[PDB]
Design a protein around this ligand. Structure first.
Ligand SMILES: [Cl-]
Ligand SMILES: [Cl-]
Ligand SMILES: [Cl-]
Ligand SMILES: [Cl-]
Ligand SMILES: [Cl-]
Ligand SMILES: [Cl-]
Ligand SMILES: [Mg+2]
Ligand SMILES: [Mg+2]
Lengths: 265, 265
């Protein structure tokens, strides 16, 4: 029942197995999100290589992208917004703009909204989530705090600053939220390691708190926070460098490989 | 050539005269924006009361809503983002949430993007603007600064916090940006009075500076700043009260009348 839905970089796919995928139309992302609960058994009962096709952002045009700051202890929570045009795919380069010398990474688990809602009650949060995706809240910290009048939208909003995927891991038949363990490496070296059990606000409370002040629609994405190990937390800092490769992994949500390139002056 | 396009509260309309409107389909908002320059002469050459029909937000589902802080001297500029679900119509109530006792008004002129762009050059900015709308960047200042870790997205993002309209005043044949004079009153009393000549960053420079870090699509809205006279700028403050009526006016962009109601505890 937990389907894994991809986008061929519009064309939806589902994972046949953990190594193989198939096109789905023959058998809009936001518009397929809103119809998943009834066709989920259809698609699942009615059930080629993943290394050989190009995979996009699973939700390529979310209505809004909400990101939470300070939702882990090693990194109350602050609601940020990322430009929807920051959205990017699971193998796409992160491009450090000409205007930044302090580009940071932040591995997060995103939920994708499946039914609209406002002042969603905690116990009903699960009914509004279509599923989950791996994500990164890439942030140009020097742009965001040009004198540490913050420019947080600017710092989080450039193209390529919201990598997502490789798939939407659907909620299927779940009556509660799932738990994930996730890691981010750069050139093979461990930078971040988290479990969603360390969230100050769990998935349900995230949906509750965000929707307490922002009305949500199907296709909206919420990044639920990053743990410690970010670039800014060291001396010297460990910000993204030209030629770094970000590798992010979660057992249920797949893997990202994001090459880093600087814009030239 | 400067058409005035409304939305019947989807159904587009054009203003026949300053007192009368007509439906347009027989003769998507974002999708009509992207086709305006070629049908503009069609609609204009091929050219009932306004007090008798309900008028909506002219762009009801913009992809993103950007708002500028500090773009007037009496109020460098800071880029904010409003939730697209804050968008609201020209006669719709502003609803002060249960969680705010400091709801402020900010009359602004918005531009609406008509052609996509990123790192738009100043002299080409006009080619990317479909037109202009009156707007308000309503802000719950106590939510935004819960200890004057800012919650600016929260403070600007509630439903009803981005009134727009009554119409999209199109660019038509203009080779440069136009000038507007605008005012906001509450229960007939003058609060704010501005002219776009006082913008620190003019319309073209707004498009340039915003698009220098955020990629823009057709249907995106930019609020270009508010002048002085906001609630927070007085002792005692002059924040929106239950039963206040906001009246905003610009000669070319029409008028708003927004009743204020508090959510009960
Ligand atoms: Cl989409
Ligand atoms: Cl749960
Ligand atoms: Cl996992
Ligand atoms: Cl729209
Ligand atoms: Cl100009
Ligand atoms: Cl005017
Ligand atoms: Mg974050
Ligand atoms: Mg403003």
């Amino acid at each position: 029942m937990n389907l894994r839905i991809v986008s061929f970089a519009w064309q939806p796919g589902v994972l046949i197995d953990d190594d193989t995928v198939a096109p789905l139309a023959p058998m809009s992302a936001r518009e397929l999100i809103a119809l998943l609960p009834q066709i989920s058994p259809l698609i699942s009962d009615e059930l080629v290589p993943l290394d050989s096709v190009a995979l996009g952002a699973p939700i390529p045009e979310p209505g809004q992208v909400i990101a939470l700051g300070f939702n882990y202890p090693t990194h109350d929570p602050v609601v940020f917004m990322k430009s929807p045009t920051s959205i990017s795919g699971p193998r796409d380069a992160v491009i450090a703009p000409r205007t930044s010398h302090a580009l940071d990474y932040e591995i997060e688990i995103a939920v994708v909204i499946g039914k609209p809602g406002y002042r969603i009650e905690r116990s009903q949060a699960i009914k509004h989530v279509a599923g989950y995706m791996l994500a990164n809240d890439i942030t140009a910290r020097d742009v965001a705090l040009p004198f540490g009048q913050a420019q947080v939208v600017r710092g989080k909003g450039y193209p390529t600053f919201c990598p997502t995927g490789p798939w939407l891991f659907t909620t299927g038949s779940d009556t509660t939220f799932e738990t994930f363990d996730f890691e981010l490496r750069i050139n093979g070296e461990l930078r971040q390691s988290g479990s969603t059990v360390d969230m100050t606000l769990g998935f349900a409370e995230v949906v509750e708190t965000v929707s307490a002040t922002i009305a949500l629609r199907a296709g909206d994405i919420i990044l639920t926070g990053t743990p410690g190990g970010c670039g800014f937390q060291f001396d010297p800092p460990r910000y993204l460098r030209p030629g770094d490769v970000i590798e992010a992994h979660s057992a249920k949500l797949g893997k990202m490989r994001l090459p880093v390139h600087d814009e030239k002056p």
